[PDB]
A paper describes a structure:
To assess the impact of ligand binding on the structure and dimensions of the US28 ligand binding pocket, we determined the crystal structure of apo-US28Nb7 without an extracellular ligand to 3.5 Å resolution. In contrast to the chemokine-bound structures, access to the extracellular binding cavity of US28 is significantly constricted in apo-US28, where ECL1 and ECL2 collapse inward. CX3CL1 displaces ECL1 and ECL2 away from the receptor core, uncovering the binding pocket but causing minimal overall distortion. Conversely, CX3CL1.35 distorts TM1, TM6, and TM7 away from the receptor core, resulting in an expanded binding pocket. US28 was truncated by 10 amino acids at the N-terminus and 44 amino acids at the C-terminus. The protein was concentrated to 28 mg ml−1, aliquoted, and flash-frozen before crystallization trials.
Human cytomegalovirus (CMV) has ‘hijacked’ a relatively ligand-specific human GPCR, and repurposed it through evolution to serve as a highly cross-reactive ‘chemokine sink’ as a mechanism to subvert host immunity. US28 binds with high affinity to many CC-type chemokines, in addition to CX3CL1. US28 signals constitutively via the G protein Gq, and cells expressing US28 exhibit constitutive cell migration, which is thought to principally occur through β-arrestin signaling. Single chain fusions of US28 with intracellularly directed nanobodies (Nb7 or Nb11) enable purification of stable, apo-US28 that can be used to stain yeast cells displaying chemokine on their surface, thereby solving the general problem of structural instability of GPCRs purified in apo form.
Residue numbers in the entry: 22 to 315, 997 to 1122
């Protein structure tokens, strides 16, 4: 035999604290993500869909931590039926978190390098598929863990000794090798394009994508590197004393809790690294528990054209395009400002196709796009004298989520002096 009674009892108090830490910040940060994109605003692009789904996978994960904490406090208190069920939510939430993390890069891969964009309706459908794929891939990971023994876990007293090895290989490549290979290749292809583009945020874009990979490695690699030498023990390629298995168990415990911190960093790696999500969160925090908050060129410029004077009921076509080579723009829109009034949105269209019009112009104006040329046109039929304002063109950028691309502004006058 080989006893492990003292190693688990000495690591338990350290593990219980970090669990509470991961449960505290992970539940707050991942609730704010969902709350920011759905409160007093709606879903805009295909990234928000995957962001919510990633936050949903993290919430389901973090909600198991208080149950895991009650398990260490009293080992017996967890029965069979809850342990298999609690373990089911653990792996399903883990694989879906990894599935959607990979989908972040791919959707931004096809959008940046290949200029193919997915609308929200398609992104929701794929999200359903990813949850299904995460469940079917988690079946062999909890069906063996349904042991209400002294310690709930694999407990491979039965099954062949190669069964944990196949499960580790499937776990090592499915949860680390394949995800890290895709997001490294995707963000490398993207970074080498942005660094040469004319984007005014090209510096921070690459630094954002680099942070995603580093945090993913320094938090997941220690756990899979420890599973690698554990699989080496099962393969009988290396020797293992009783003490060696105890050192390997303690290394498994600490590095596994390290991987649990990754679900607390996902809000800081995708969502709240963007200025638009920071400003949107700052307004939500402002109504309740925060204070209301109260280059410029020589790069990419928005060429505007189509303004002029026209009688009431006439027609105009506004045109806007990017004067540089930028590949990180995912949406553009039109804004106007009447004398003595504030700047208001009139028509916004994303490169996925989802359009959004203002109340006063809906049914009269029609906004259209061109992805390959980064151009957006606004057909203004049945013009009214109330539409007399200075129309500005705006462009939005991906990853960093900035909308500081503005045009010079074109004039649209309807109510003027006309003779018989």
């Amino acid at each position: 035999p080989c006893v492990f009674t003292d190693v688990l009892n000495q690591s338990k108090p350290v593990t219980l604290f970090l669990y509470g830490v991961v449960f505290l910040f992970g539940s707050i940060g991942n609730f704010l993500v969902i709350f920011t994109i759905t409160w007093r605003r709606r879903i805009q692009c295909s990234g928000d869909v995957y962001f919510i789904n990633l936050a949903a996978a993290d919430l389901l994960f973090v909600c198991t931590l208080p149950l895991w904490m009650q398990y260490l406090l009293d080992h017996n208190s967890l029965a069979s039926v809850p342990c298999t069920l609690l373990t089911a939510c653990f792996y399903v939430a883990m694989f879906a978190s990894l599935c959607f993390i990979t989908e972040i890069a791919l959707d931004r891969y096809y959008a940046i390098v290949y200029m193919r964009y997915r609308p929200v309706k398609q992104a929701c459908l794929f999200s359903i598929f990813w949850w299904i794929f995460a469940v079917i891939i988690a079946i062999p990971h909890f069906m063996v863990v349904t042991k209400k023994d002294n310690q709930c876990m694999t407990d491979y007293d039965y099954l062949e000794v190669s069964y944990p090895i196949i499960l580790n290989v499937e776990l090592m490549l499915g949860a680390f090798v394949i995800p890290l290979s895709v997001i490294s290749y995707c963000y490398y292809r993207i970074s080498r394009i942005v660094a040469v583009s004319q984007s005014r945020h090209k510096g921070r874009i690459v630094r954002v994508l680099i942070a995603v990979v580093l945090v993913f490695i320094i938090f997941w690699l220690p756990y899979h590197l420890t599973l690698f030498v554990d699989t080496l023990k099962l393969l009988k390629w290396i020797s293992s004393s009783c003490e060696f298995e105890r050192s390997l168990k303690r290394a498994l415990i600490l590095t596994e809790s390290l991987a649990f911190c990754h679900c607390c960093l996902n809000p800081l790696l995708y969502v709240f690294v963007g200025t638009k999500f920071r400003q949107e969160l700052h307004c939500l925090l402002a109504e309740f528990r925060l204070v209301p908050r109260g280059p410029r060129g020589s790069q990419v410029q928005l060429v505007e054209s189509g303004g002029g004077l026209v009688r009431p009921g006439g027609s105009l076509r506004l045109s806007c395009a990017a004067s540089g080579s930028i590949f990180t723009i995912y949406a553009m829109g039109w804004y106007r400002q009447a004398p003595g009034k504030q700047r208001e949105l009139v028509a916004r269209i994303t490169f996925g196709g989802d359009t959004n019009y203002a109340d006063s112009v809906k049914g009269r104006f029609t906004i259209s796009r061109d992805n390959a040329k980064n151009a957006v046109y606004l057909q203004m039929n049945s013009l009214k004298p109330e539409d007399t304002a200075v129309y500005y063109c705006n462009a939005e950028e991906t990853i960093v989520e900035e909308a500081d691309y503005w045009g010079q502004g074109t004039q649209v006058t309807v109510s003027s002096r006309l003779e018989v």
